[PDB]
Design a protein around this ligand. Structure first.
Ligand code: ZN
Lengths: 144, 313, 103, 292, 144, 101
């Protein structure tokens, strides 16, 4: 039953494929720790925002309109600034997710060629689907 | 109709006389004048203010604080002012941006979970009307800010009561597990003491017979359209109203050389004409421009006369 | 989101044969140990969000700050989903004996 | 500092001059005035209305329509007007609150299978701008209505191709569309001249307008004021000088704020406005500061 | 074979229950024909609305403000009318939702007491857990 | 839903197919799949999964029918996925059966 033993070890490495798929935090931890700095700087920007906001809440549009519009321009400036910045950080995170997902696609194909060389025909003609099915259906049950 | 405001004087049922209308209008001045006339009505009256500029001061040459106060030269006249009210009206900003029916109390309770600010704004607004009622004045005059609206506030906590009120019945099922698990005061005490008077005043405002709004405008298009928006939003919030005021309008004919004044008041006459037809159901007022830089209670008394009797040069 | 839930569910559907094959006297015990793997699943990462707040208003009427505020929700969720896992184990048993039924 | 429109007056590369700023303003009057001065500027000019009041007719006493025409008593002056300005931006108005993210093509691709909902309005506008090119006039001057903008719209369709760009009447309309959009974004070929009166409401309104412009990446340097009283040192009826104190407070407040831009004092003329002479004396006023 | 065919008949039952739980949109479609009647009437209203909107658009504010405001008021009135009808529609939808939810849960009680009549403790709690948990969790897969 | 739904019938037909059968068994199985597809006939109370290709499609031509044709094409490909692969998961199972049992 050594042939069945070897084929089930293959199927365990197939498990390994969606292990790769779920490796996303093991990589994204780096990027999260990296972004945290600008993230807290951005929170401090939000602070400044609220600061100048309540400051505005202390001024008079009817007379001190000049300073009012000045502050208002400053406010909208910093506001769109932080909004753009956080949107850009999210775009960076999505970039990382995409590229690492495709790198793990490459890991998938690497395991494919690994199994091929391992068993190294009708045998291949069958086993290819025999492993494709379980791999992709486990990937399916990952995310409905 | 009637181009004078004395209907407000005759109706002694009133207790709250709001005054609003954005733009560079002496709403503070005319409101002060209406106040002085209400005093001339021999009642127990009190003005409030919410603009940060405290124009009431310059109209009165006295300093004030968050506490009711006499005014020299008068006895029943009383002033007071609360910018903290516009400050605490910022706390419900998020509810202001939605103005829904259910999710108002829901966001209120979620923020209460966040940092307990629901009851904060609640008691904050409470203290004001609490003291107000406590002194038991005949009427109360507001000078709303030129940016926003605080009447509408009271439709918020009643929605919020839908939480607490319904919460109250779960109080029953709240009893056992606590007594089977082993400052609960703040919520119960403060809310059961505020929401009563909050309900009271909220009901009070809707009454067409004791709450009345006075918008004030200028004879020019943009301000006219603005106060029209105000009228519509007011009817939306289902509040009484009968009377608007204009300002800065002489239209004289003693002298020719005022050609600039001639055309200016021609334009303004055109615009107030456009106004009148649209506002037959409102007591229009024609409050002229005081031929002097506006200062002192003298001009207040002048406005008072002009508000009692219809002006004619 | 159902990663660990359905994962251990299918691992139960697998382990059906081993357990009703009676490896040893650890039969319902290895189920507990499968669940025990649940927290080491949280060991790398199980980031997620807590859902909306309605009855938390009643909680506030009862007090009991954030600690139990969150403990109650987490424990309710976990107890429910592990009851799920448990009689899903039992379902797998139902099918292990569907086998004997056809047998 | 810089007190007059000369920067608008002394420039060739300008082709698009806009106006705007809500309120009971003679924006049509100052529009036609600037137009006349560009005429004196020895160019090929074309005034375009959007206000359904057509006050260009009022100042010029002739009737017009979507046809660009000559102007009586003048040589290069050309007028035109379109209330379809309202239509090409009416549904695009709510679209301005329906297209503010990466889904700008969603509303135009959802019902596209049925009737291509948000495209044919842009197509009507495309015909508009086609004729606008037409006999290519050196300077087209606009007169915006008291609501909305025919400017940022032109920057909408330059998005619809994005998805299609990953590979009926578009391949010929959209080019000139992109052309004039680029024109609009340029601070050298086009500009805005908002116009305000000395009343706080209009002031705040124009403030919002300028912030919105700088947001939408247009430029501007010029704020004509209007209905300005001016009391001579002679006997002032105190009403004049009181209104003058008010306008002075507002103007002053405006000064420290819009320093980077020019300012155009422009007193209310002490008579009635029906005829050229008004626009003519305005045109005069738009070069030298007013002196009573 | 009926012996355990019953332990699977419990499945058959809960299958029917949940597919009916998804079927409830059928009676909701009857309510939708009701909504289609009142939608005809509200569509008449909408046509009026577009008409008066265009009318408005034909009018000058700076010189005929009267008509403009009178219109605007009429417009918002028609709008409150349509909003009231929308409220009525979603309210009767909540009504049908609640009554049909009660129908579902009371048929749950019905099948409960039925299977009880058919067996007449541990087996019962087993019954309940199988049906509720397993079928509701596959329902979560198909309808989270 | 019907993924594991028909998976259940596959779990049932395991012993059927490994049991003495004439010329071809899987055909029978494969026919029940079509029955499950008939389940989509009432069960259509859903909406389209958001796409970015309808733009290029309406750029291409004849959208009134081709988008629905393509959506049903992808549905049929999903049917291939589901049916074929749960069937062969069952097949792997009965292989484990005939090996170790
Ligand atoms: Zn004068």
């Amino acid at each position: 039953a050594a042939d069945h033993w070897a084929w089930l070890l293959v199927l365990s490495f197939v498990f390994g494929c969606n292990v790769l798929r779920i490796l996303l935090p093991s990589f994204s931890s780096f990027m999260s720790r990296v972004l945290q700095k600008d993230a807290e700087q951005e929170s401090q920007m939000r602070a400044e925002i609220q600061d100048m906001k309540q400051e505005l809440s202390t001024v008079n549009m009817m007379d001190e309109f000049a300073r009012y519009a000045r502050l208002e321009r400053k406010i909208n400036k910093m506001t769109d600034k932080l909004k753009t910045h956080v949107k850009a950080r999210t775009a960076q995170l999505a970039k990382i997710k995409w590229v690492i997902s495709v790198a793990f696609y490459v890991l998938q194909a690497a395991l494919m060629i690994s199994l091929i060389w391992k068993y190294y025909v009708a045998g291949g003609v069958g086993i290819t689907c025999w492993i494709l099915v379980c791999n992709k259906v486990v990937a399916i049950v990952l995310h409905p | 109709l009637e181009p004078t405001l004395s209907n407000i004087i005759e109706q002694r049922s009133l207790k709250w006389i709001f005054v609003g209308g954005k733009g560079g209008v002496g709403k503070t001045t005319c409101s002060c004048s209406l106040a002085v006339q209400l005093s001339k009505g021999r009642e127990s009256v009190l003005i409030i203010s919410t603009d940060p500029a405290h124009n009431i001061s310059d109209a009165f040459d006295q300093k004030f604080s968050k506490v009711p106060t006499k005014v020299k030269g008068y006895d029943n006249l009383f002033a007071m002012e609360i910018d903290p009210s516009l400050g605490v009206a910022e706390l419900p900003d998020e509810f202001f941006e939605e103005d829904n029916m259910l999710s108002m109390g829901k966001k209120m309770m979620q923020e209460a979970m966040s940092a307990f600010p629901g009851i904060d704004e609640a008691m904050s607004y409470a203290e004001v009307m609490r003291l107000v009622k406590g002194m038991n004045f005949s009427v109360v005059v507001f000078d709303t800010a030129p940016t926003g609206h605080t009447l509408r506030l009271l439709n918020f906590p009643t929605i919020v009561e839908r939480g607490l009120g319904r919460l109250m019945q779960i109080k029953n099922q709240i009893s056992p597990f606590i007594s089977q698990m082993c400052n609960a005061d703040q919520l119960a005490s403060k809310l059961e003491e505020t929401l009563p008077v909050i309900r009271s005043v909220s009901e009070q405002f809707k009454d067409p017979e004791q709450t009345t709004f006075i918008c004030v405008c200028i004879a020019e298009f943009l301000s006219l359209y603005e106060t029209e928006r105000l009228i519509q939003e007011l009817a939306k919030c289902k509040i009484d109203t009968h009377n608007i005021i204009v300002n800065q309008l002489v239209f004289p004919d003693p002298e020719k050389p005022c050609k600039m004044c001639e055309a200016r008041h021609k334009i303004q006459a055109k615009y107030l004409d456009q106004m009148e037809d649209l506002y037959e159901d409102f007591h229009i007022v024609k409050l002229p421009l005081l031929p002097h830089e506006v200062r002192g209670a003298d001009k207040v008394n002048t406005f008072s006369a002009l508000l009692l009797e219809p002006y004619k040069p | 989101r159902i990663f660990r839930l359905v994962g251990c569910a299918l691992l139960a559907l697998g382990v059906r044969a081993f357990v009703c094959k009676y490896l040893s006297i650890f039969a319902p015990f290895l189920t507990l140990q499968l669940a025990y793997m649940g927290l080491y699943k949280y060991f790398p990462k199980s980031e997620k969000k807590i859902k909306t707040t309605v009855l938390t208003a009643a909680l506030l009427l009862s007090g009991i700050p954030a600690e139990v505020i969150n403990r109650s929700m987490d424990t309710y969720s976990k107890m429910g989903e592990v009851f799920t896992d448990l009689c899903v184990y039992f379902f797998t048993f139902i099918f292990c004996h569907e086998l004997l039924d056809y047998w």
